[PDB]
């Protein structure tokens, strides 16, 4: 399914049957992304202030993120505050 990532700072979420993507971002335009069932990707010029995908690998370009930029837990893949460099273009979760 396709879903639009809306910048401006409001925290938004999108889910499908479950895989959920929660984010807040800044940038010039709304971007249409896709969720495949879990892979979340931009078919990105947005600057993410936060990201969390819940039910793993994260990429700045679809180029992996540095290990320090994110954390993989029991049910989620989230940005590491203060280490995440604000660029996210693809998330892959195998559960």
């Amino acid at each position: 399914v396709a879903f639009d990532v809306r910048p401006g700072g409001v925290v938004h979420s999108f889910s499908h049957n479950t895989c959920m993507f929660t984010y807040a971002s800044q940038g010039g335009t709304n971007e249409q992304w896709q969720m495949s069932l879990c892979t979340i990707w931009r078919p990105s010029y947005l600057y993410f202030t936060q990201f969390k995908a819940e039910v793993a690998m994260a990429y700045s370009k679809a180029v992996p993120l540095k290990t320090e930029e994110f954390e993989v837990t029991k049910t989620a893949v989230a940005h590491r505050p203060g280490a995440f460099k604000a660029e996210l273009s693809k998330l892959v979760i195998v559960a």
Epitope: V1, A2, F3, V10, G28, Q32, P43
Partner: antibody, heavy 121, light 109 residues
């Protein structure tokens, strides 16, 4: 009840400008895109552009060549379409319509009643 | 930009028959396709969304099918009130989220 209430018919001279309004009731405009659609007499529907009232992001079909400007006022829960350098090609009915942000919600479920614009001296 | 080609441009079908209207996208639109009905002097009305889902309050005689670039709107057991214009619209990629050229449906009697 969801309603989109558009402003009255306009009679405007060639070269002039109009600002059309679309007042939303029963929902918050920050939760949807507000789209604008043109329909020339005896012609099909043509998507003009949209605004996301939560962040003010607005985009258009390039064919309008910057002649359309879409704005929104969240306090009054109203979206607007401004058309400039009007010609006889701009004589049409203009509709506002709300739409969502994902596959199951993009399609415009609620539409305004339309505003007729006649470009004539 | 993605262009939508709607066919046929016009149809004349009797009450009780089946109507099939097709919409072809210039590239894969991944089922991000809606169908609207419009009557003279009235606003368009959503019939089908995301290629195959019936909108609230739409009669069950309406259905949508398709994937990739090819989509269809079907009207089973056509009723006299089903005359009007029908349009498809896509919601894939960077806007414009363009409409098809339309299909004019006449009731044959």
């Amino acid at each position: 009840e969801v309603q989109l209430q558009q402003s009255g018919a306009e009679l405007v001279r060639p070269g002039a400008l109009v600002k059309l309004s679309c007042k939303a009731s029963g929902f918050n405009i920050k939760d949807y895109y507000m789209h604008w659609v043109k329909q020339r007499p005896e012609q099909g529907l043509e998507w003009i552009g949209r605004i996301d009232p939560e962040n003010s992001n607005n985009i258009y079909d390039p064919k309008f060549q910057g002649k359309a400007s879409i704005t929104a006022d969240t306090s009054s829960n109203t979206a607007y379409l401004q058309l400039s350098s009007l010609t006889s090609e701009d004589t049409a009915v203009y509709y506002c319509a709300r739409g969502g942000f994902d596959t199951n919600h993009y399609a415009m479920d609620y539409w305004g009643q339309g505003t007729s614009v006649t470009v004539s001296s | 930009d993605i262009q939508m080609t709607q066919s046929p441009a016009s149809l004349s079908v009797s009450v009780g028959e089946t109507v099939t209207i097709t919409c072809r996208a210039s590239e894969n639109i991944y089922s991000n396709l809606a169908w609207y009905q419009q009557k003279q002097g009235k606003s368009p009305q959503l019939l089908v969304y995301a290629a195959t889902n019936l909108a609230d309050g739409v009669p069950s005689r309406f259905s949508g099918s398709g994937s990739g670039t090819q989509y269809s709107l079907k009207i089973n057991s056509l009723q006299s009130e089903d005359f009007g214009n029908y349009y498809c619209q896509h919601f894939w990629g960077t806007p414009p989220w363009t409409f098809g050229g339309g299909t004019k449906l006449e009731i044959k009697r």
